[PDB]
Amino acid sequence: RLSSRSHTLRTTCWDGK
Amino acid sequence: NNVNDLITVTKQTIKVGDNVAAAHDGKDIEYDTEFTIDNKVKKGDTMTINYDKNVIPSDLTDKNDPIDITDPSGEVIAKGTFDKATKQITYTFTDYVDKYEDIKARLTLYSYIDKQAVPNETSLNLTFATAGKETSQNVSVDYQDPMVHGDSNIQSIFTKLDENKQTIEQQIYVNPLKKTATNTKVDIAGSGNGSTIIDQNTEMKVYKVNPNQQLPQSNRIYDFSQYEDVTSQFDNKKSFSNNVATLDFGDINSAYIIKVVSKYTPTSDGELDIAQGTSMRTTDKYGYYNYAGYSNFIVTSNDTGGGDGTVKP
Structure with missing residues (x-):
């Protein structure tokens, strides 16, 4: 009566200057 | 003491909620059965239901007992017992079947892809059953x-x-x-x-x-x-x-x-x-x-x- 799911999220992180 | 032959399956459908088992979208598998119990069934008798060998009723909890069948009021009709090994419910009948005749009952049991059985993407013929009377459907398992x-x-x-x-x-x-x-x-x-x-x-x-x-x-x-x-x-x-x-x-x-x-x-x-x-x-x-x-x-x-x-x- 119980099971999981999956999800995806992507970002990129650079430097402001 | 098994009274399977005494049980009249009026309905049995396997659904997948397309015939695609999205085990990782947490897709379930319905088995919606209905049947008739004849009056020749008495206290202490045993009919069965088995799941496909490649499923499991609960993915992440070992607490996968079978539900018990209950009349509208709440008097118990049978109490089931699930054996993981054989992936089979055994439903024992209470004294309801002695007090009552002409007994019609429905079930609907969900289950998940057994991740131990099926470690990799594949197609399967699923075989479910209600009192020995099997039914089937083909599926594919996407991970x-x-x-x-x-x-x-x-x-x-x-x-x-x-x-x-x-x-x-x-x-x-x-x-x-x-x-x-x-x-x-x-x-x-x-x-x-x-x-x-x-x-x-x-x-x-x-x-x-x-x-x-x-x-x-x-x-x-x-x-x-x-x-x-x-x-x-x-x-x-x-x-x-x-x-x-x-x-x-x-x-x-x-x-x-x-x-x-x-x-x-x-x-x-x-x-x-x-x-x-x-x-x-x-x-x-x-x-x-x-x-x-x-x-x-x-x-x-x-x-x-x-x-x-x-x-x-």
């Missing part, structure tokens, strides 16, 4: 693929949850593509705000996978004997900040598995609104940070069914 962002690649699902001790287990494939990953850092977090609890004590074991080894597309490992336990290596590589653990892999070329057991907090509403996430970081060509991330959350089926009878005069 989720990892998120990729440059080198950063990762995937994860929930494996085992313990309603008693309030813990939940997540199994993570760091670098399933065995890429060359530079300053790899992997975070695990309650998620994306919070639903669980991650801190120094949350259990995190880490295993290295040699390049010849291939991981189960189910995303659930059952045996850790045959993987290098490297957990101590990551002793001096754990940062902990705001329900977030951070692991310093450094430069890697090898896949890795992480086993995260984490305490969760119960919801007052009394449903399991639980969720947890990871994310893999790698520096890229241009010296940026690429983040591939994964988040899992729990899904709930629940069997249902009742009965009804003429009251004997």
